[PDB]
Amino acid sequence: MNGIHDVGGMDGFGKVMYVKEEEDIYFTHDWERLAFGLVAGCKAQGLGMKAFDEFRIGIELMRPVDYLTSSYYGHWIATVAYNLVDTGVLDEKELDERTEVFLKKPDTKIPRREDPALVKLVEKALYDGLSPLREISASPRFKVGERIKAKNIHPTGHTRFPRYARDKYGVIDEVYGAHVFPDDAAHRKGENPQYLYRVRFEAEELWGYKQKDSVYIDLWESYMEPV
Amino acid sequence: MNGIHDVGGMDGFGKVMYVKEEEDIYFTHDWERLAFGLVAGCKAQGLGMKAFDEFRIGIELMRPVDYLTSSYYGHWIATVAYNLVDTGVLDEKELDERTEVFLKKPDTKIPRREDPALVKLVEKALYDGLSPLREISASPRFKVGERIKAKNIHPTGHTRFPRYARDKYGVIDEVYGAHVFPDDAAHRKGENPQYLYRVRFEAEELWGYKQKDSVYIDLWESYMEPV
Amino acid sequence: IDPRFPHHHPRPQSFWEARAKALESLLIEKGHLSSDAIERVIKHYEHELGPMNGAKVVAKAWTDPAFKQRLLEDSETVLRELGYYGLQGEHIRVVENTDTVHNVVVCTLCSCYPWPLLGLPPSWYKEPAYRARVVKEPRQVLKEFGLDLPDSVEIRVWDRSSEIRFMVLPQRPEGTEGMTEEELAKLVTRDSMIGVAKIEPP
Amino acid sequence: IDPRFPHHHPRPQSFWEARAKALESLLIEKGHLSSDAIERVIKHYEHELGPMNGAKVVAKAWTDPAFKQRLLEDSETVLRELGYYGLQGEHIRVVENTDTVHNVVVCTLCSCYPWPLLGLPPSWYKEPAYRARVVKEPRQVLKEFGLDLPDSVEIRVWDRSSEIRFMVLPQRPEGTEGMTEEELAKLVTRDSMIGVAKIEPP
Numbered sequence: 001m002n003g004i005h006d007v008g009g010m011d012g013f014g015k016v017m018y019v020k021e022e023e024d025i026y027f028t029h030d031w032e033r034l035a036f037g038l039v040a041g042c043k044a045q046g047l048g049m050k051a052f053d054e055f056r057i058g059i060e061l062m063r064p065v066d067y068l069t070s071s072y073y074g075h076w077i078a079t080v081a082y083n084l085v086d087t088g089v090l091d092e093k094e095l096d097e098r099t100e101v102f103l104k105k106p107d108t109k110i111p112r113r114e115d116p117a118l119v120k121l122v123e124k125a126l127y128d129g130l131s132p133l134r135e136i137s138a139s140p141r142f143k144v145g146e147r148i149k150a151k152n153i154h155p156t157g158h159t160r161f162p163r164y165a166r167d168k169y170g171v172i173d174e175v176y177g178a179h180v181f182p183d184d185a186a187h188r189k190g191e192n193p194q195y196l197y198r199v200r201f202e203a204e205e206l207w208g209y210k211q212k213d214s215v216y217i218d219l220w221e222s223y224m225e226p227v
Numbered sequence: 228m229n230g231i232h233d234v235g236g237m238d239g240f241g242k243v244m245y246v247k248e249e250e251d252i253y254f255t256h257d258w259e260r261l262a263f264g265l266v267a268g269c270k271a272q273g274l275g276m277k278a279f280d281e282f283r284i285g286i287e288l289m290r291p292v293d294y295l296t297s298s299y300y301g302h303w304i305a306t307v308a309y310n311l312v313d314t315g316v317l318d319e320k321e322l323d324e325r326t327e328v329f330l331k332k333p334d335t336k337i338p339r340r341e342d343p344a345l346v347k348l349v350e351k352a353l354y355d356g357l358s359p360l361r362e363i364s365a366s367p368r369f370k371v372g373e374r375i376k377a378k379n380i381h382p383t384g385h386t387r388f389p390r391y392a393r394d395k396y397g398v399i400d401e402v403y404g405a406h407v408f409p410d411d412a413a414h415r416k417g418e419n420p421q422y423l424y425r426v427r428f429e430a431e432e433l434w435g436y437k438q439k440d441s442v443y444i445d446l447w448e449s450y451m452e453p454v
Numbered sequence: 455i456d457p458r459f460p461h462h463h464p465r466p467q468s469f470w471e472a473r474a475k476a477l478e479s480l481l482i483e484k485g486h487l488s489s490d491a492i493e494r495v496i497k498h499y500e501h502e503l504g505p506m507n508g509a510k511v512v513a514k515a516w517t518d519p520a521f522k523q524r525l526l527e528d529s530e531t532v533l534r535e536l537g538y539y540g541l542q543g544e545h546i547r548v549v550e551n552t553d554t555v556h557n558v559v560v561c562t563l564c565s566c567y568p569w570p571l572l573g574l575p576p577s578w579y580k581e582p583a584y585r586a587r588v589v590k591e592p593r594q595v596l597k598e599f600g601l602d603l604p605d606s607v608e609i610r611v612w613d614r615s616s617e618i619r620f621m622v623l624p625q626r627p628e629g630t631e632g633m634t635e636e637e638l639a640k641l642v643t644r645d646s647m648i649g650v651a652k653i654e655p656p
Numbered sequence: 657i658d659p660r661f662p663h664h665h666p667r668p669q670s671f672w673e674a675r676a677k678a679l680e681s682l683l684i685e686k687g688h689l690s691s692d693a694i695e696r697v698i699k700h701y702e703h704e705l706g707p708m709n710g711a712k713v714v715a716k717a718w719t720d721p722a723f724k725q726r727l728l729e730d731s732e733t734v735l736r737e738l739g740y741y742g743l744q745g746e747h748i749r750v751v752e753n754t755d756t757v758h759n760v761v762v763c764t765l766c767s768c769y770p771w772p773l774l775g776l777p778p779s780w781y782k783e784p785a786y787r788a789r790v791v792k793e794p795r796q797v798l799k800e801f802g803l804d805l806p807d808s809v810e811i812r813v814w815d816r817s818s819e820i821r822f823m824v825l826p827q828r829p830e831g832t833e834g835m836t837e838e839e840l841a842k843l844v845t846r847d848s849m850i851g852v853a854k855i856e857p858p
């Protein structure tokens with residue numbers, strides 16, 4: 001989707017807010033910590049999302065005005081809500097009512113429950129991770145060193161193909177192997193893995209600029225075609 | 228500039244808010260009326276802006292979060308402020324202080340002044356308009372029917388070349404004549420007029436889509452090259 | 455406001471209001487503007503202009519074949535002769551809807567609209583949804599206006615990237631036999647002159 | 657709220673807070689989450705992980721040529737052997753800064769960052785300014801961090817569009833003769849492993 005999230009190459013967002021590492025506080029509000037717990041806790045159990053693909057599309061679907069103002073963990077809250085409702089884990093009406101309760105009475109008590117089995121399960125997920133690497137029977141269409149065409153495609157659903165790289169020539173830098181295909185997986189349409197490549201693009205090609213800059217982007221096979 | 232204003236081809240902005248014409252109120256707040264008066268009144272006298280080019284870049288430069296939330300006449304206020312300060316008509320510190328006065332005391336009295344000569348001058352501007360059409364000594368580079376290349380250019384200043392049309396093939400539909408060149412004029416760098424063309428682009432070329440849709444865009448000569 | 459995240463925090467609309475008043479006050483104090491100059495503009499755009507002008511041009515085109523021919527051959531000369539000319543209406547073109555061609559006008563980059571002929575643009579015309587979507591999925595956008603064109607009808611979207619303006623000339627509907635030019639003009643909607651609606655039979 | 661313009665009005669951050677609590681409450685009531693599962697996650701990301709892990713890898717590379725060679729030849733095997741593996745760190749690559757090549761890592765589409773090796777990303781890394789700009793004007797972005805590279809130095813920006821993660825291996829600075837591996841590790845900054853800074857002489 002050609003959304004507000006896809007910012008690469010945009011002008012006008014201003015200076016980067018530099019801060020020294022030691023002063024770069026992770027969390028300033030408890031709800032931000034909670035957002036992390038919600039995301040990892042749900043994902044570890046496959047609730048609403050099993051990999052990050054579905055997670056990302058829920059963020060991408062935010063109203064632009066929300067995306068730009070919610071703050072970062074606001075994205076995480078938005079996508080957990082989106083995905084839990086979308087998959088039928090939570091009912092939208094119930095979620096909205098409960099939201100209203102905490103809006104009007106922020107000090108409403110949170111129910112307590114200990115589940116050490118669930119802790120172990122979550123811990124296992126944090127340490128084991130979840131690799132999207134798969135094997136497929138096909139061979140790679142492209143080879144290291146090949147000049148390829150990064151296609152002009154405009155999926156309305158999820159994609160990992162940034163707009164700034166579309167309709168451009170690039171050079172294959174590496175064949176990673178086959179990875180779960182985001183444009184399908186984010187919409188629960190199957191892993192349908194495809195070869196993933198790293199592709200180098202020159203500044204002259206991306207922007208028409210004259211400096212010694214390049215961008216290395218990872219692109220799925222179906223994003224590209226031979227020249 | 229590849230800014231938040233350049234929305235053509237973006238996904239996620241949602242449904243169009245249909246409203247019946249008779250119910251589609253022009254203004255709901257007096258400051259919105261005032262914004263119109265400020266823009267036209269200043270422009271009529273060449274204060275901050277002489278044509279719409281400088282006007283547009285001031286809007287394009289807004290913080291994205293402001294652009295999306297200010298409401299439409301908020302853009303107009305932002306660009307009048309920007310341009311009057313940029314050209315030295317108003318001092319930023321004085322403007323900020325006076326803003327603060329009206330923030331804390333909204334009912335602060337507005338000074339009254341009648342200037343019938345100025346009224347006539349403004350009226351003349353509203354009726355006479357201001358055509359950007361010029362004559363130049365050069366001939367057009369392109370001809371009706373010619374298949375051209377809409378270049379992949381990425382000016383960081385003002386342009387009228389929407390990103391969705393860049394790096395595409397199109398067909399010349401009309402040679403309008405030479406018009407004041409926005410990419411220069413918006414930055415007070417001279418009219419430097421160039422031939423303006425209307426160019427037809429097919430849906431297949433813009434989006435890879437299969438319906439009988441096309442877009443007719445007006446492009447300055449320097450945005451394009453022969454094939 | 456965490457100084458890492460000033461960009462999360464929009465100006466409230468009270469800011470723009472205050473800013474407007476501050477500009478107004480300073481410019482009048484400095485002799486750059488006057489109360490009556492500001493009011494003159496507001497009167498013009500809120501009251502003097504409107505879509506009725508375009509409606510008259512459409513009705514005339516429907517009732518006078520020679521006029522319609524001249525309009526389509528050289529709209530800028532014809533419209534200027536009628537007095538529909540001014541700021542943001544210096545160069546106005548007219549495109550005819552036909553049975554297999556449907557025209558839609560947009561300013562993707564902002565809001566460009568022919569004020570002297572049509573008055574101020576619709577609320578939605580200036581907003582991102584219409585602007586973003588109409589160049590890419592015009593059929594979907596049109597359906598939200600109640601216009602569901604067949605696949606076989608070609609759509610031409612006219613993105614106003616220059617100061618050239620376009621008005622859509624919509625087709626005269628059924629059921630209008632014997633109507634006067636003035637009566638037909640009352641049928642012509644603002645939306646029909648942008649391309650987001652056909653005109654209904656009376 | 658004028659129903660023409662709901663998109664002008666962001667959710668306040670109090671909404672997200674309330675929403676978070678509502679989700680937490682409902683999920684615990686339904687048996688999907690527990691208090692201790694949520695706390696376990698918070699402990700891991702706020703306290704257990706951090707850039708010190710990457711720092712140790714850098715210092716080892718500087719002090720042990722054979723290790724640096726293995727790391728650059730097959731980083732994923734080597735990093736997994738060290739235990740720097742987990743969620744968002746399943747496939748970690750390492751790119752070496754050299755005198756004429758400077759590496760910078762970004763996730764233009766979101767925030768992708770190798771948590772198991774580097775901990776949580778910088779505030780600015782996740783925000784639009786860095787994300788938008790670093791792929792197009794990296795020299796300008798780097799200058800805002802105090803890194804002013806000569807034109808002759810090539811910049812390679814690594815946009816993390818897949819789950820493959822990258823760490824930058826920065827060069828050992830002058831003035832470090834005789835330092836132990838542990839002492840060198842204390843020199844390695846988070847920013848240097850993203851590519852937005854070189855390491856200063858002690």
Ligand SMILES: [Cl-]
Pocket residue numbers: 551623624625651652653
């Ligand atoms: Cl029609």
Ligand SMILES: [Cl-]
Pocket residue numbers: 753825826827853854855
């Ligand atoms: Cl370095």
Ligand SMILES: [Co+3]
Pocket residue numbers: 561563564565566567
């Ligand atoms: Co416009």
Ligand SMILES: [Co+3]
Pocket residue numbers: 763765766767768769
């Ligand atoms: Co990311």
